[model samples]
Target chain A: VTKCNITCSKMTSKIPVALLIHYQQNQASCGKRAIILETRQHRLFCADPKEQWVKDAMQHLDRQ
Target chain B: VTKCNITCSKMTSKIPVALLIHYQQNQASCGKRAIILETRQHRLFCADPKEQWVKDAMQHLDRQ
Candidate 1:
């Protein structure tokens, strides 16, 4: 699983939280980007670009 | 990695295999669905609702 924070930590931070998740998962070729949050409540949000990783992650969870 | 079988064990079982995977990952917002099987050989199958997990999983695997 992969996780990114709401705050930008580096130059790469320019990438949106959702995109970062996608890039990481795409590069790894395994695992999933399971969570995204703006606040600590862990309230759910939708993917901005609809990252392939997020979409697939959701699907996999649904099946189980 | 999560796994569910063909044998329906509960009321939510009506949701269908593909949808179940989708929901779980969405709720968690992470992970991928790697394998689906019909028999012990683990013969691969397609997502019925075309779970996002399966598509992303295949794409990730392909890149590797």
Candidate 2:
């Protein structure tokens, strides 16, 4: 398979989706950096231990 | 206590949230037929066992 020719505009979410995975949200095929799953309200989906928001999102009952 | 953000409601339930409890989803503060915790997704609170959805929700491992 070839790569996706995608673009994001006016990006303004905490995660700022850099790449998107459309096949049930697997990042293995995304062609950009900062891979994102094409789903809604679900934020911060990558593996890194530094961001505080990621920590918060990891909580089962995390709220603002 | 300014009632602690239970501040009353949204998302009308067929369960008829007649009484709501801000005190951490307990029954003492609520006095209606169907009491709600003023929280979120978790539908069909516990009470009657005849309701199948409650049975489903009660399972520690439930699926869609």
Candidate 3:
């Protein structure tokens, strides 16, 4: 079983920021990147499963 | 072969904007979004396969 603990930091829209990526190796963190339009708040946007990361992350969630 | 005539429109950063996403389907558009940071240019962002759109799109590129 994998611990699969997920956490993130803040980023700014300074220039080249990419999308929700496959963070955490082997197990999968399923972390995504988001930019707030007005504030330019860069957040680790994956408390929700709208993205496939959730399913990918959850796959490692349960194991014997 | 699927006619992936992918064209895009410009969007302003007056509100929330997420990262590049799957724009085209079936054949796999795999399009992601990006921001200019300084100027905040909203472009179609799939001219390059730095994202996965290329492979997914290319899979359907040549079919007999």
Across all candidates, the chain A TM-score values are: 0.27, 0.25, 0.24
- The Cα local distance difference test for each model comes to 0.27, 0.27, 0.28
Pairs of colliding residues, candidate 3? A20-A32, B20-B32, B20-B33
Question: What is the model-wide C-alpha lDDT for candidate 2?
Answer: 0.27
Which 10 residues in a row give candidate 3 chain B its minimum summed lDDT? B4-13
Report the number of the highest-TM-score candidate: 2
Task: List each candidate's DockQ score.
Answer: 0.02, 0.02, 0.02
Number of backbone collisions per candidate:
24, 0, 3
In candidate 3, what are the lDDT values of residues B1-64, reduced to their tens digit?
4322221223222222233332322123413332221112322221333335444443433331
> Predictions ranked by TM-score, top down?
2, 1, 3
Candidate 1's C-alpha runs over 4 A off are: A1-42, B1-64
The worst-scoring run of ten residues by lDDT in candidate 3 chain A lies at: A35-44
TM-score of chain B of each: 0.27, 0.24, 0.23
Docking category for candidate 1?
incorrect
Candidate 2 second chain TM: 0.24
Per residue, candidate 1 scores C-alpha lDDT tens digits across A1-64 of 1322121111111223332211111112212322332212322232322455445544544454
DockQ of candidate model 1:
0.02
Q: On residues B1-64, what C-alpha lDDT tens digit does candidate 1 reach at each position?
A: 3222111111111222332212112212222232322212212222322556545544444454
Worst 10 residues of 2 chain A by lDDT: A20-29
